[PDB]
């Protein structure tokens, strides 16, 4: 049984915590619920930590008083098909392998499944750790509660004796690095300096051995990623997001200065040895748009290359942890502003960007976002109970499972079938244009070897490579983004027609150049 | 928002409650969750109640930390 | 009404039958249930048959006393979609036509459906008899009971006046030969010598005119394929299986000498004119693994070519009826040991194997097989009845239809949805790797004409052809095998990554060789 | 066995933290958790049939008891 400690004693040295804890809705929640600090108190001074106290990062630390929210979060949606590769004719990107050739995603890129699995799925995907980590057996793939208790309760490491990234099976890659983990867990929140910069007080950084870092991490999507454990108030903890919104002054809503001011973020910095160490962003309101943007954004979390001179940009560079915080039509400018690209296409040799799940940036400017609707309204709504205390569902899933609460409450003019039909109209149309964009990209890609072999000039090939950058960007945004156009259908339509235009321009350029070589 | 009270001061007069509260699984649950005793503490002695503190009997006093049980 | 005959009179000349019949659970079942032997008894001697008795091979001969088993066998699973071509984007092998080009399966290869249809489906598929046989109309495709009563009650022959294999429609093939029928029916069990070798007493053999043989055959999957009609004990009748297990001493479980000894097979040979003629394999136990391996195996049942010199291997050769009895990683060695391949690829010219439904060989060494689980546990379980006499279901179908009896009885920790999710995790992952294997095989195949036309040497082309053999084997095993990895997920993963590796090696070889030609 | 085992059982969850249901109601609503977990030999219909055999028999004897009470009262 827990025994309370005297918080006044802590507050003597921890004024920032005092100011947060004594004012919010956790004012009565004793420190012992989440910290074991006995030896810390015996050995600390006002500026020196002494013995390090233990801090619980497990989600059970919150489930004791908030069981309903914990249970709704951990539920597994079995209809979210697991380990389903996207580069197949029945999934999101039928021609993904030809289009992404050169990139590590060619090794495996599955559709997302329930949040409980995020850390284990990151560890076991074929592109991440060379196949080093597996579930203990193929049965454990169902065990969401086990994954939440801890990744290492359900996974095995093929070689606990080495810590290098290497292939354990032939068709795997070693794309994982420490930046990835920031969108899977925050177990390392006290062990990682802001942005993953080098820091005397940080055990882990962007340049750490990722296999060693992985072994220290256990829990997915900690409850405190969106809720300050001291004030219980709304926040974000993700460094890259704080950096975009606050350090770079872009605001929570870059396209709306007024909403950015009403629904803003305040950066709070904690020090080690009186030197800035880590930061959080306190939100003005409980704004799930910005909470979910900690992870559902396009980002860099990887090494790459410079557009200017092609030189390598390694994990040690700040750009290896970056939120572009730009919609699809501002993205090229955002990548140029940091002089960065992801990979060279294996067939065309074009410098290309790699896009990843840009739901937040796509949602900006859409009809729903403009009307003040937020992610949680459709994906984690309040529960409706005939007789019960209302709480917010933490299931985070498609509104198809709760259409009454997620759509029909606002759309009184519709039945559930009508609302589903409206969603499917948009997804069907958008998917048709994704498929057509891939057809044209593939047709362009296939002309590159024919053009090289016919003696087409490097000048003409480079012209086609510049077109490839845009054809790729304006297509891949939409296979990366998970709503298949729903979050912003007009923008998806404009972008995908732009992709097709760019590919068609490149096909015409290469076809003509090949024909001229042949005729000469 | 609830503000915690000094339970040790309560216990100077409330030994029976001390022996129950400090040992069980509500040892970290502050009295303010269920009692409003400010004027009581200002006026009581160990032998005179003074102002009668308020005790919450509503089920919401428990539903805050135990929503699943309350809802079922 | 049947009138019994005096079996003692038969036993005077039929000692093997006496020893089987008098001891088993059919000791009280009179011969007249399955034989009309009156004129036989009048004319036979102890060594000469005289008039041939009639033997019933229809399944109704067993349904009279075993209606529950018969009815469960004949049920049609309407959810097993019929006539569904596998070479489509929504089925098992989206790029099958490019990959299999040169082989008769290019003409049609559908997914399997219920066992009642096996003989009719073999007769009507476009690759088998040149389109000679059809259902009487398109309505009859539903009639499982009719097909069981007899193929020729539901089919038509376009030309009863000729018996040659030829095309009746342009896009058909004539791949059928008499060996095929051994996995569709055993109506010919008294008319076919062991292995289909030539024999004075055999009406039919490997070299027979298959159209004439077809017309003599009626019933699918005779009940006596797994149950001796005399002793009622467990057996197999399939010659190729007996040959692998017993003649070649490979055992019922080639990877487990102890299980092979506990769950073994005894070959029993019957003679004609005191010369060996036919054989059965009596099983030590009622082992459905080996019963189902009569048909659900990789096999040769066709002519082919020698790896050594490329010469034709015809139906007259023993190798045209062959069970390899080898898992995917032992298969290349098994084909080399008989010096055999199936076809030359139409585009690459590579000698290639053709793989077919290797469920038995894939199941070996899997977690379930190692724990003593057998096909019937998941595909024909005991019925569960609140109040009833238990019998074994003969429906032979996916466990999805009976998860309580086929999975959940062993997996108490799971709900039906959890068990389905576990299956789908494996099938989704395996299918993703099949699709990726096909992408790389197709990329390699497309380089062959480009390489030939660029003047790439035969030496380099032959190097790529050797790689094609392996890339093909390690992919096709898994489109052929029906569980999409479920029966052995780790082996599927290792094999498919091997396929991709082999194709990638060949792509790099050909791309470099083409580039060098162009540069010269 | 105690009242809670049949009338306020532990909740069964595929993935979740277990708690005790406080919905103190007939086991007919939750037969998996309030009956069949202990009676593996039965389906839900069989367990319901066993309950109804007792209730029907008992109710018939209640009605007969009332018939005889009423006959006495009327005298
Ligand atoms: C002054 C004598 C202190 C008292 C009393 C307590 N703590 Fe402390 N703590 C102190 C220092 C100088 C530091 C280093 C950070 C800083 O502010 O300079 C800390 C650090 C912590 C941490 C962070 C530990 C980590 O892993 O990074 C926690 C969780 C913490 N302290 C908790 C804590 C509690 C709960 C206390 C009362 C029981 C407490 N501290 C007393 C200085 C002092
Ligand atoms: C019991 C000892 C608690 C533990 C452990 C945690 N929380 Fe809590 N929380 C608790 C109470 C009594 C309240 C107030 C309830 C009320 O509505 O009056 C809360 C409140 C929250 C809130 C809402 C805050 C707000 O709206 O301003 C959140 C988001 C919250 N709590 C989250 C939370 C998390 C993430 C925890 C683990 C780190 C956690 N709480 C622990 C009681 C208890
Ligand atoms: C980083 C810590 C994340 C935050 C914050 C949010 N999400 Fe998320 N989400 C994340 C990952 C890594 C995954 C895939 C997990 C896996 O194992 O595959 C997801 C998944 C979703 C899904 C799909 C769920 C399903 O049933 O398939 C949805 C609908 C989703 N995420 C929505 C969402 C919303 C609305 C958020 C703010 C409340 C949110 N997520 C936060 C990573 C992270
Ligand atoms: C936050 C900005 C992220 C970083 C950094 C990484 N990932 Fe991620 N991941 C993120 C979200 C919001 C989702 C769900 C939405 C989606 O489109 O997938 C994911 C999902 C995964 C998955 C499951 C799906 C899949 O691709 O197979 C894996 C295996 C995964 N993520 C791995 C991964 C790796 C290896 C990373 C560093 C290179 C990485 N993620 C970074 C959010 C974020
Ligand atoms: C961001 C992706 C979140 C994570 C991770 C967690 N919660 Fe949450 N929570 C979130 C939102 C958007 C809201 C609603 C805010 C609003 O007012 O609209 C909530 C709410 C809570 C509350 C308040 C009571 C309620 O509304 O249900 C509690 C007590 C709470 N959340 C607890 C909780 C716990 C225990 C978590 C880990 C399992 C958890 N939250 C994660 C957003 C996010
Ligand atoms: C209602 C107006 C929505 C708001 C606001 C947000 N999303 Fe959404 N999302 C919506 C729909 C109708 C769909 C398609 C779901 C389907 O079943 O067809 C989606 C999809 C997602 C997904 C993929 C979910 C899945 O396929 O299982 C994710 C990860 C997702 N959305 C995230 C997300 C975030 C982070 C949002 C705020 C920025 C957001 N959505 C807003 C409906 C709505
Ligand atoms: C949050 C501030 C709480 C309030 C208000 C109430 N309870 Fe509580 N309770 C709380 C915690 C953190 C725990 C321990 C959880 C754990 O298992 O570690 C409890 C425990 C209980 C129990 C279980 C006790 C036991 O098993 O020994 C019961 C029966 C319980 N609580 C009941 C209860 C009632 C009836 C309340 C209103 C008067 C109540 N609790 C308030 C947190 C909080
Ligand atoms: C009635 C006259 C029968 C005909 C015709 C067939 N069988 Fe039979 N069978 C019969 C009886 C009375 C029994 C014994 C039942 C018992 O359990 O005591 C059987 C048994 C079988 C068995 C089980 C054998 C064993 O477990 O050892 C099988 C597999 C069986 N019978 C199969 C079978 C087949 C395939 C038939 C047609 C060729 C057939 N039986 C005919 C009664 C009768
Ligand atoms: C040769 C005589 C066979 C034996 C012995 C077994 N099977 Fe079979 N099976 C066979 C064929 C030719 C077919 C396809 C029939 C058609 O017309 O397409 C099949 C089909 C199956 C299926 C799929 C059924 C469906 O619903 O689609 C299953 C699950 C199956 N077979 C399993 C199986 C098992 C477990 C066996 C041993 C008890 C078994 N079969 C024997 C050929 C033959
Ligand atoms: C036993 C070793 C077999 C021989 C010899 C032949 N077939 Fe077959 N066939 C067999 C099984 C176990 C199945 C079901 C599993 C599957 O993957 O299909 C089949 C199925 C068929 C089908 C239906 C499916 C299809 O391919 O369209 C047909 C039309 C079929 N088989 C025809 C066929 C021909 C023409 C054969 C000789 C060349 C032949 N089969 C041999 C088992 C066996
Ligand atoms: C092999 C592919 C089989 C064919 C063809 C038939 N049956 Fe079968 N039968 C099979 C197995 C694996 C079993 C269970 C053996 C065990 O003990 O586990 C059976 C069982 C029988 C029995 C016994 C009673 C029972 O268990 O139901 C009978 C009477 C029986 N089978 C009859 C039967 C008939 C009439 C068939 C043709 C319609 C038939 N079997 C085909 C395997 C195979
Ligand atoms: C349970 C542990 C199984 C054992 C033992 C065997 N198989 Fe199986 N099989 C299993 C599953 C879960 C699946 C996928 C079914 C689905 O609906 O997803 C299969 C598939 C088959 C098929 C194809 C069935 C179809 O698609 O309709 C066949 C022909 C099949 N399996 C045959 C088979 C044989 C011959 C076995 C013993 C060697 C065997 N299976 C074992 C589960 C299990
Ligand atoms: C399972 C073995 C039981 C135990 C232990 C207890 N009761 Fe029960 N009760 C049980 C059944 C099967 C029924 C009939 C319900 C039906 O739907 O037919 C009951 C009935 C009640 C009722 C009336 C419920 C209603 O009609 O809605 C009450 C008030 C009730 N039981 C209370 C009760 C108490 C207080 C117990 C412990 C002393 C108790 N029951 C034990 C099954 C079981
Ligand atoms: C008696 C009629 C009860 C009333 C009134 C309430 N609860 Fe209860 N509670 C009861 C039992 C029999 C049990 C299980 C004890 C066991 O270990 O078997 C419980 C349990 C709790 C718990 C512990 C966690 C759990 O098992 O769910 C808590 C937190 C709890 N109960 C809270 C609770 C609240 C908030 C109530 C008022 C709405 C409540 N209980 C009423 C019996 C009784
Ligand atoms: Ca990116
Ligand atoms: Ca073969």
UniProtKB/Swiss-Prot annotation, chains A, C:
Family classification: Belongs to the cytochrome c-552 family.
InterPro entries in the cross-refs: Cyt_c552, Multihaem_cyt_sf
Record: residues binding Ca(2+): 298-299, 354, 356
Pfam families, per the entry: Cytochrom_C552
Name listed for the protein in its UniProt record: Cytochrome c-552
Job description of the protein: Catalyzes the reduction of nitrite to ammonia, consuming six electrons in the process. Has very low activity toward hydroxylamine. Has even lower activity toward sulfite. Sulfite reductase activity is maximal at neutral pH.
Binding-site residues for heme 1, renumbered to this chain: 10, 13-14, 40
One GO process term, biological-process aspect: ammonium ion metabolic process
Keywords: Calcium, Electron transport, Heme, Iron, Metal-binding, Oxidoreductase, Periplasm, Signal, Thioether bond, Transport
Binding site for heme 7: 368, 407, 410-411
Catalysed conversion reaction: 6 Fe(III)-[cytochrome c] + NH4(+) + 2 H2O = 6 Fe(II)-[cytochrome c] + nitrite + 8 H(+)
Post-translational modification (record): The thioether cross-link between Tyr-299 and Cys-301 may play a structural role in the active site cavity. Besides, it may lower the pKa of the Tyr hydroxyl group. An additional covalent bond between Tyr-299 and Gln-356 has been observed in some protein crystals, but this may be an artifact that is due to the formation of tyrosyl radicals when the protein is exposed to oxygen.
Cofactor comment: Binds 1 Ca(2+) ion per monomer.
Any one GO molecular-function label of the UniProt entry: calcium ion binding
PANTHER family named in the record: CYTOCHROME C-552, CYTOCHROME C-552 RESPIRATORY NITRITE REDUCTASE
Regulation: Inhibited by azide and cyanide. Subject to competitive inhibition by sulfite.
GO cellular component: outer membrane-bounded periplasmic space
